[PDB]
Ligand binder design. Structure first.
Ligand SMILES: CCCCCCCCCCCCCCCCCC(=O)OC[C@H](COP(=O)([O-])OCC(O)COP(=O)([O-])OC[C@@H](COC(=O)CCCCCCCCCCCCCCCCC)OC(=O)CCCCCCCCCCCCCCCCC)OC(=O)CCCCCCCCCCCCCCCCC
Ligand SMILES: COC1=C(OC)C(=O)C(C/C=C(/C)CC/C=C(/C)CC/C=C(/C)CC/C=C(\C)CC/C=C(\C)CC/C=C(\C)CC/C=C(/C)CC/C=C(/C)CC/C=C(/C)CCC=C(C)C)=C(C)C1=O
Ligand SMILES: CCCCCCCCCCCCCCCCC[C@@H](O)O[C@H](CO[C@H](O)CCCCCCCCCCCCCCC)COP(=O)(O)OCC[N+](C)(C)C
Ligand SMILES: CCCCCCCCCCCCCCCCC[C@@H](O)O[C@H](CO[C@H](O)CCCCCCCCCCCCCCC)COP(=O)(O)OCC[N+](C)(C)C
Ligand SMILES: CCCCCCCC/C=C\CCCCCCCC(=O)OC[C@H](COP(=O)(O)OCCN)OC(=O)CCCCCCC/C=C\CCCCCCCC
Ligand SMILES: CCCCCCCC/C=C\CCCCCCCC(=O)OC[C@H](COP(=O)(O)OCCN)OC(=O)CCCCCCC/C=C\CCCCCCCC
Ligand SMILES: CCCCCCCC/C=C\CCCCCCCC(=O)O[C@H](COC(=O)CCCCCCC/C=C/CCCCCCCC)COP(=O)(O)OCCN
Ligand SMILES: CCCCCCCC/C=C\CCCCCCCC(=O)O[C@H](COC(=O)CCCCCCC/C=C/CCCCCCCC)COP(=O)(O)OCCN
Lengths: 105, 175, 114, 70, 113, 83, 98, 318, 115
């Protein structure tokens, strides 16, 4: 079913391309390199069954970096509250958020 | 948010897919697939994939030219069908159009899990990365790596292309 | 999940380097020769800490070293340097090669004065 | 031819001179007179964006020299 | 036929020699301007750090003002369990700003031609 | 020796395009392995600094790492200028 | 998720449906197969670019290679069917039953 | 100010096409011991204006059996793509500066063929269909060779950016390093623009008017404009690719003049070739591209991959 | 954004030329005039009948050789790598199998058109 010829011969036929944290050209990093490094090191050698429970924190952080679902939710909440308080005139946006900032290098 | 260009491009992508999936005459199916390939080129270009977009456009242009030749050779009928010359083709086209409409509405005005998961919208620009470095294109680097990292991939694809030539010769022999 | 700590806007202030990219490119080689020490300290900090919030003082030392370098240049020969970076600035790619006379004059200037 | 072919060739050559000369002149006119900046890579774009920010007039072409560092 | 083929091969060899010299010189020039970029990079990194941190602080203060009435909202609460620094998402940095800055930040480089 | 002679004769007489193609292909295949400059090309590619050279933390036990770029230790590109 | 991702997955579903529901011509189904490949290429490219997996930039090209092989294979079979019947209709191929 | 540049590029190109028609008529005339247009305007200068005005005041007809939508779309696509193919050409600066300009040129050219295919099919006429199938065959004949020739020539350049070709040739024309590829490329551009002896699609002797026989008046003039624009565009590209003109940053007009002279020479060479030779049979063109050009092109691609490595001559800008 | 404006301008100019061509001149369309052209006479059959393709096998082969171009276009960038011996070996290997597939179809009479 899975004859691990690569591991028996030490070949690396396709393992160079399986993960995002593995030796990219010119050392260009993946967007989620640290999260994946952490999740891989947390779950290494403990087996699949233990890794899903005991490394769920690292994997949840990794998935958040990948898809950013909670970040978009928080931004949407903030902007809805801003829209609501602006419509009634309660809140006034600062100049550096309207296009009149003092830009810095 | 900003101009929603890529949203318009992906909607036109879906519309071209409905165009050729409605299964009308192949001359118009290939036209729909060419339109889809072009707007998909545009979609990928808007994310930093210049080479991949231009490449898929080139490949599908060549493929659809071969398909046009084969359509005139073997797919012709006295009256080729368009999207309005048939109740069946027109119905499939309209159902696909308003199905895309319903998906897009239900997705952008509230937040529903259609089949896999949910989405609120916001425009594609939010998920970008603001990374600042380089005298190169990372896409071009990753694609050039096929000749130093991807030896195994080059081997299997070259073998499959040679075998593909042999195979079409075997299939079209007759006897 | 915890609050993110951020520096106040006061601790983020510094005397900026407000010269354009052509000036920086015209000075880059001597600037890398002279201000090597604080720049390398800052980059080592930056790459060991993996947190921009932990290397603000090194960055401010980087700014002050750049400003001292440019003050020396302004004090000893602004005119050859201005010639050189104007030549560099005309080019749409900012190519070093099209300006060798101006670069030679600037280099003799800094070699003899400093 | 035979030299009566040359007037049409000259008209065609004058028509073909226009695009390149017009592009050069329009580039110089809308880029401070100094050959529109090329940004093939993101480092060059970052240089242009920094230049735009420090100009103070929101234009990348305006260049600040040593007269801007007191 | 010999003379034609000989002229052709001689032309090719002259061209090869010339291009060899010119491309070596071009590679030296590329190394030189790469090294200029290397000498300049620390200053850019320092000011990029300060710019990112300042934008995040401004967003934090505006969010402290905007989200004061909502009952159970921690201002500046991370969405990650980890406590290490996470590179800010583009939307987070420019979330509360004008559409022109957001366009320039997302598509400015791609669209520049 | 004489079989292949008349064979290449007939090929040059009947299909000079294929003769030239096989000659050019064979040269392209075999000549790069006999060249003293292939290593020069590898070295030129290695000397191109695409990314920032991250400095090392000095521990007092690095006699062959420079402490300033213009110090004599480290690699030299002198071979390249004279090339 | 983003609106763009939803649209590409919808394109795949529509092409899959098109392939599944046959009409008269075989060429139309072959086109639907190509459409599915096109949507897979776009989806994988978007995911790869977004996460900056550099080495994975080559897999959409491999995808295209195999897609071309499949397309070539499909056209050969169509040539043989048309030579047998003078038409590329699905209804003609009913010789074998279950 | 950018629309000013767009119009600056387009209005002149259409005028140059108009007068290329006159130059071709006069050059073919003088090679045939006659004169060509010398009556409408001094030296036939006003002949293109009369032709255009005559074509756009004549009745355009839509065939009864034709598919009207594609019938009308095909010339629009032809002319709009012919105009679009000019925007990345560095003369010495391009209107649009692209990283992959060569590859954009390839894709737009490859899309240009559909207009001929669609127009022939839309017409629903026998001769139009025969012309369209000849176009299919022509693309199959030259498409693979043309792309590999560009790749081989471009290896010395280091990228697909068209403006880099000026720097690549600061001291020598790239034709002194690849004149075999230059010959095969010239013939492939003859075939790619449907020009004698490779102009099978029109098939004037064989098929009367080929794909555009049905077309009349303004729609016909649009196909004509598109073809002649493509003839100038291909030659200009050939000039930039193989005969780089020295460029002075502070005086780009010199580059512009040099470049325009070289592209005019190549266009006149097309006209000369048309005046000199018999037409290729369409099956023969395929044999010519697949049995002679493709083996040499594969071998020369191998050679041009190996050569910069053998000699430590590899170009900059990965 | 500039390329979008360029494409829009070009398509608009061409469409306006078509519009002028169809709305400026006098129109006198009748059935005889709008009928199909076949050199003096009425066509026997339809132009939508199947039109045999004698180069059908070269057309399928073009599909596979066109994808060889997608694998060879990154070669200018591949030349910049450090292990040039692996890159050159792989690039050479790819073109050799492309030459062998051409030699196979050529020797098996696959490039001859159907008769
Ligand atoms: C959501 C809806 C999607 C929008 C559809 C787009 C607009 C097309 C609808 C109008 C065309 C039909 C008009 C007609 O029948 O005769 C008119 C009228 C009626 O003549 P008739 O003799 O009385 O009757 C003829 C029969 O009824 C029938 O005669 P027929 O045989 O001509 O009918 C066939 C026709 C009938 O149309 C239909 O059957 C229904 C229309 C649905 C078609 C959509 C299918 C999906 C195709 C791909 C998606 C394209 C984008 C769509 C998204 C829109 C946003 C951009 O189908 C078509 O040909 C439509 C072609 C549109 C594709 C244009 C793209 C060109 C490709 C360029 C290269 C690609 C580059 C990469 C990108 O005659 C005229 O007025 C003269 C011709 C007018 C045509 C002008 C140009 C055609 C439309 C331009 C396309 C828009 C491109 C932008
Ligand atoms: C062996 O006989 C033959 C020839 O030899 C005598 C030919 O020349 C020949 C070629 C056809 C010629 C008669 C040339 C015909 C000239 C064109 C059709 C006129 C095209 C000119 C206009 C349409 C261009 C537009 C006009 C504007 C002035 C350009 C600017 C545009 C504005 C927007 C500004 C053929 C086919 C031929 O068979
Ligand atoms: C046990 C049976 C053996 C014979 C039968 C095997 C059948 C399968 C065909 C060949 C097996 C594959 C072996 C090659 C795997 C490639 C990986 C390995 O060889 O390393 C490569 C070594 O490269 C060599 O060139 C090997 C490739 C040579 C193979 C060419 C022809 C062999 C295939 C022949 C059969 C294929 C189908 C038939 C076509 C004729 C790359 O090493 P290197 O670049 O240093 O370092 C990479 C890491 N970096 C990127 C960080 C630097
Ligand atoms: C280079 C590209 C751009 C060039 C720049 C110019 C752009 C030109 C755009 C193309 C149109 C020009 C065509 C020239 C002739 C006009 C064609 C048409 O528009 O005119 C008539 C339009 O008239 C309509 O038939 C009805 C007339 C009124 C319709 C009511 C519309 C609402 C207006 C309300 C009237 C109050 C005054 C309005 C002004 C404020 C059509 O009549 P018809 O005979 O079939 O067509 C044959 C025309 N002939 C005779 C010249 C050969
Ligand atoms: C039609 C085929 C579309 C192909 C367009 C290619 C244009 C192009 O290559 O320009 C590239 C340019 C810059 O790329 P770089 O080379 O990396 O340089 C800039 C980075 N510093 O990219 C862009 O500007 C992207 C702009 C948006 C893409 C345009 C999308 C066009 C799609 C056509 C759709 C047609 C309209 C919709 C309906 C179609 C049929 C009715
Ligand atoms: C000024 C008068 C305006 C009249 C507008 C009428 C438009 C129309 O469709 O009418 C049909 C009209 C003339 O026919 P009749 O009505 O019979 O005769 C008119 C004289 N009595 O036909 C036309 O001219 C249609 C011309 C096309 C208009 C432009 C829109 C076409 C869209 C094409 C999209 C495809 C583009 C593909 C290329 C781009 C890809 C990069
Ligand atoms: C090791 C090098 C490999 C890489 C280089 C090659 C890359 C591309 C070149 C090869 C492309 C494929 C070639 C396919 C061969 C087809 C053979 C064939 O059948 O054609 C023969 C024609 O060719 C032959 O005669 C058969 C083979 C004869 C020898 C051909 C060349 C063999 C090698 C010659 C040179 C040897 C090496 C070069 C040494 C040069 C001297 C120093 C029949 O011609 P028809 O078209 O059918 O004619 C129809 C009308 N009667
Ligand atoms: C030290 C290492 C060097 C490596 C080798 C480099 C030297 C290579 C030496 C040979 C180079 C030859 C290249 C030529 C490529 C094709 C030659 C060819 O054989 O093609 C002809 C056919 O080609 C033609 O004749 C062309 C037909 C159309 C002619 C169009 C007009 C004529 C050309 C006008 C001048 C061309 C100018 C080109 C360059 C312009 C400047 C950019 C073969 O066809 P047949 O004779 O019928 O035989 C086939 C059956 N055995």
């Amino acid at each position: 079913p899975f004859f691990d010829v690569q591991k028996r011969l030490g070949l690396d036929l396709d393992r160079w391309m399986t993960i995002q944290s593995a030796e990219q050209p010119h050392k260009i990093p993946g967007r989620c390199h640290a999260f994946e490094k952490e999740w891989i090191e947390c779950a290494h050698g403990i087996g699949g069954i233990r890794a899903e429970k005991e490394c769920k924190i690292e994997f949840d952080d990794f998935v958040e970096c990948l898809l950013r679902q909670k970040t978009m939710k928080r931004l949407s909440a903030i902007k809805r509250q801003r829209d609501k308080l602006i419509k009634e005139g309660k809140y006034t946006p600062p100049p550096h958020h309207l296009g009149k900032e003092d830009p810095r290098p | 948010m900003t101009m929603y260009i890529a949203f318009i491009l992906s909607t036109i992508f879906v519309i071209g897919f409905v165009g050729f999936s409605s299964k009308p005459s192949p001359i118009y199916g290939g036209l729909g697939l060419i339109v889809s390939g072009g707007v998909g080129c545009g979609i990928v270009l808007n994310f930093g994939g210049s080479f991949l977009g231009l490449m898929v456009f080139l490949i599908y242009l060549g493929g659809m030219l071969v398909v046009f030749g084969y359509t005139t050779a073997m797919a012709t009928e006295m009256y080729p069908e368009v999207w309005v010359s048939n109740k069946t083709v027109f119905g499939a086209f309209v159902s696909g159009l308003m199905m895309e409409f319903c998906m897009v509405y239900y997705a952008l005005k509230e937040e529903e899990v259609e089949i896999i998961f949910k989405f609120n919208g916001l425009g594609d620009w939010v998920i970008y990365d603001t990374g600042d470095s380089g005298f190169f294109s990372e896409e071009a680097m990753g694609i050039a790596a096929l000749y130093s990292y991807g030896t195994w991939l080059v081997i299997v694809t070259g073998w499959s292309l040679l075998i593909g030539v042999v195979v079409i010769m075997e299939i079209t022999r007759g006897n | 999940p915890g609050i993110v700590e951020l520096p106040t806007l006061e601790d983020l202030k510094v005397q900026e380097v407000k010269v354009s990219s052509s000036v920086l490119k015209a000075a880059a080689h001597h600037y890398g020769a002279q201000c090597d020490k604080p720049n390398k300290e800052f980059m080592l900090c930056r790459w060991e800490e993996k947190d921009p919030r932990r290397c603000l003082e090194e960055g401010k030392l980087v700014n002050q070293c750049a400003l001292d370098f440019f003050r020396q240049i302004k004090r000893h020969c602004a005119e050859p340097f201005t010639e050189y970076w104007t030549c560099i600035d005309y080019s749409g790619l900012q190519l070093f090669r099209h300006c060798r006379k101006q670069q030679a004059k600037f280099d003799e200037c800094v070699l003899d004065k400093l | 031819m035979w030299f009566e072919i040359l007037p049409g060739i000259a008209v065609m050559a004058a028509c073909l001179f226009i695009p390149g000369m017009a592009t050069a002149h329009i580039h110089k006119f809308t880029n401070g007179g100094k050959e529109k900046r090329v940004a093939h890579f993101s480092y060059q774009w970052n240089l242009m964006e920094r230049d735009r920010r420090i100009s103070g007039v929101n234009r990348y072409h305006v260049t600040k020299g040593l007269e801007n560092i007191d | 036929g010999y003379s034609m083929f000989a002229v052709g091969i001689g032309t090719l060899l002259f061209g090869y020699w010339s291009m060899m010299k010119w491309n070596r010189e071009r590679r030296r020039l590329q190394i030189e301007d790469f090294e200029a970029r290397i000498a300049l990079m620390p200053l850019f990194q320092a000011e990029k750090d300060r710019r990112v941190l300042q934008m995040l602080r401004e967003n934090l203060e505006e969010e402290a003002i905007i989200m004061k009435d909502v009952p159970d909202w921690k201002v500046g609460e991370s969405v990650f369990h980890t406590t290490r620094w996470v590179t800010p998402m583009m939307g987070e940095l420019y979330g509360l700003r004008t559409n022109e800055e957001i366009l320039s930040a997302t598509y400015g480089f791609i669209w520049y031609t | 020796a004489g079989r292949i002679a008349s064979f290449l004769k007939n090929a040059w007489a009947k299909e000079p395009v294929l003769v030239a193609s096989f000659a050019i292909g064979g040269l392209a295949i075999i000549l790069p392995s006999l060249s003293p400059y292939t290593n020069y090309a590898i070295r030129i590619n290695r000397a191109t600094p695409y990314n920032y050279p991250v400095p090392l933390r000095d521990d007092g036990n690095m006699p062959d790492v420079p402490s300033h770029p213009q110090d004599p230790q480290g690699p030299s590109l002198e071979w390249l200028k004279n090339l | 998720m983003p609106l763009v991702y939803m649209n590409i997955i919808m394109a795949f579903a529509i092409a899959l449906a098109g392939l599944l529901m046959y009409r008269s011509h075989l060429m139309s189904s072959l086109l639907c197969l190509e459409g599915m490949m096109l949507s897979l290429f776009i989806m994988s490219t978007l995911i790869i670019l977004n996460t900056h997996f550099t080495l994975a930039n080559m897999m959409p090209i491999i995808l295209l290679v195999f897609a071309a092989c499949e397309a070539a294979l499909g056209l050969s079979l169509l040539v043989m069917v048309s030579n047998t019947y003078g038409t590329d209709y699905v209804q003609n191929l009913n010789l074998l039953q279950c | 100010m950018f629309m000013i540049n767009i119009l600056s590029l387009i209005i002149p190109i259409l005028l140059a096409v108009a007068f290329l028609t006159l130059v071709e008529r006069k050059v073919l005339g003088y090679m045939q011991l006659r004169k060509g247009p010398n009556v409408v305007g001094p030296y036939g200068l006003l002949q293109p204006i009369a032709d255009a005005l005559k074509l756009f005041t004549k009745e355009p007809l839509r065939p009864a059996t034709s598919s009207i939508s594609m019938f009308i779309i095909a010339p629009i696509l032809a002319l709009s793509l012919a105009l679009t193919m000019w925007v990345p050409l560095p003369m010495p600066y391009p209107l649009i500066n692209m990283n992959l300009g060569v590859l954009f040129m390839l894709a737009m050219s490859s899309l240009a063929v559909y207009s001929i295919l669609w127009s022939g099919w839309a017409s629903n006429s026998k001769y139009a269909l025969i012309g369209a199938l000849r176009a299919v065959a022509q693309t199959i004949s030259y498409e693979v060779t043309l792309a590999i020739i560009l790749l081989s020539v471009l290896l010395m350049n280091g990228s697909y950016t068209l403006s880099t070709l000026i720097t690549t040739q600061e001291h020598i024309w790239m034709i002194f390093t690849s004149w075999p590829l230059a010959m095969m490329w010239f013939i492939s551009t003859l075939a790619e623009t449907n020009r004698a002896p490779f102009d099978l699609t029109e098939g004037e002797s064989e098929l009367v008017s080929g794909f555009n026989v049905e077309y009349a008046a303004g729609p016909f003039a649009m196909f004509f404009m598109a073809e002649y624009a493509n003839i100038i565009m291909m030659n200009a590209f050939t000039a930039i690719l193989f005969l780089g003109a020295s460029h002075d940053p502070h005086t780009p007009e010199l580059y512009t003049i040099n470049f325009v002279l070289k592209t005019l020479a190549l266009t006149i060479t097309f006209l000369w070739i048309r005046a000199s030779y018999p037409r290729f049979r369409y099956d023969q063109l395929m044999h010519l591209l697949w049995k002679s050009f493709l083996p040499l092109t594969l071998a020369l691609c191998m050679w041009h991959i190996s050569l910069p490595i053998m000699t430590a001559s590899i170009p900059p800008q990965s | 954004m500039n390329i979008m404006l360029t494409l829009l301008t070009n398509v608009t100019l061409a469409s306006l030329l078509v519009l002028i061509a169809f709305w400026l001149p006098q129109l006198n369309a009748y059935s005889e005039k709008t009928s199909p052209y076949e050199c003096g006479f009425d066509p026997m059959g339809s132009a939508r009948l199947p039109f045999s393709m004698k180069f059908f096998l070269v057309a399928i082969t073009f599909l596979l050789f066109d994808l060889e171009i997608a694998l060879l276009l990154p070669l200018p960038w591949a030349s910049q790598t450090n292990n040039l011996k692996t890159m050159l070996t792989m690039a050479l290997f790819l073109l050799i199998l492309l030459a062998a597939s051409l030699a196979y179809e050529w020797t098996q009479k696959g490039l001859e058109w159907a008769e």
